[PDB]
UniProtKB/Swiss-Prot annotation, chains A, B:
Subunit (UniProt): Homodimer. Interacts with the E2 ubiquitin-conjugating enzyme, UBE2D1 (via RING-type zinc finger). Interacts with myosin regulatory light chain (MRLC) and TMEM4.
UniProt free text on domains: The RING domain mediates ubiquitination and the neurite outgrowth inhibitory activity. The FERM domain binds phospholipids and mediates lipoprotein receptors recognition at the plasma membrane through their cytoplasmic tails.
Induction, as annotated: Expression is directly activated by NR1H2 and NR1H3. Expression is not dependent of the sterol-response element-binding proteins (SREBPs). Expression is indirectly induced by LDL.
Shown residues in whole-protein numbering: 373 to 436 of 445
Protein name, UniProt field: E3 ubiquitin-protein ligase MYLIP
Coiled coil (UniProt feature): none
Organism: Homo sapiens
Zn finger limits (RING-type): 15-50
Expression sites (tissue/organ): Ubiquitously expressed.
Role description: E3 ubiquitin-protein ligase that mediates ubiquitination and subsequent proteasomal degradation of myosin regulatory light chain (MRLC), LDLR, VLDLR and LRP8. Activity depends on E2 enzymes of the UBE2D family. Proteasomal degradation of MRLC leads to inhibit neurite outgrowth in presence of NGF by counteracting the stabilization of MRLC by saposin-like protein (CNPY2/MSAP) and reducing CNPY2-stimulated neurite outgrowth. Acts as a sterol-dependent inhibitor of cellular cholesterol uptake by mediating ubiquitination and subsequent degradation of LDLR.
Amino acid sequence: VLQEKLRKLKEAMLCMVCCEEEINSTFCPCGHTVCCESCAAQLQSCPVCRSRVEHVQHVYLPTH
Amino acid sequence: VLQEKLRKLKEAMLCMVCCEEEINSTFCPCGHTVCCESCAAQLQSCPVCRSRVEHVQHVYLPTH
Ligand SMILES: [Zn+2]
Ligand SMILES: [Zn+2]
Ligand SMILES: [Zn+2]
Ligand SMILES: [Zn+2]
C-alpha cells in the first residue's frame, strides 16, 4: 500500500514545533521552511541552524 | 488509484517554467515559491501574480 507513502509526505508538511499547522513560513536569511505562521512569529532564531532570524517570509508552495 | 496523487504532488514540486528542475526558491515580498534557482535568477517579475521580484530567497523544504 502507498497509504503510508502519502502519510510520510504529509507528515513532513507539518510545523516542526507546534506540530499542528502546516509549514508556510520561511526564516530569512537562512531560508529554513520548517514552521507555521504563528510559530515563526515567536522564534527569534532558526530551530535548525540557530541563525538569527532577520525577517520572516510567508511562502506559497503549490504542494498546497 | 494513487498514481494521480503522487504524480500531482511530485508535479507540484517541479519548476513552473523550465519544468525540469525542482522548485527551490521563492520571490520577495511576493511569496510564491514556484521556480528553481536558475529560473528565478532570470525573472524580474513573478509568473503567478506579476509583481516585481525584489529578492529571491533559497527555500530549504522538508520534502526536497
Ligand atoms: Zn507551529
Ligand atoms: Zn535556518
Ligand atoms: Zn526552472
Ligand atoms: Zn507572486
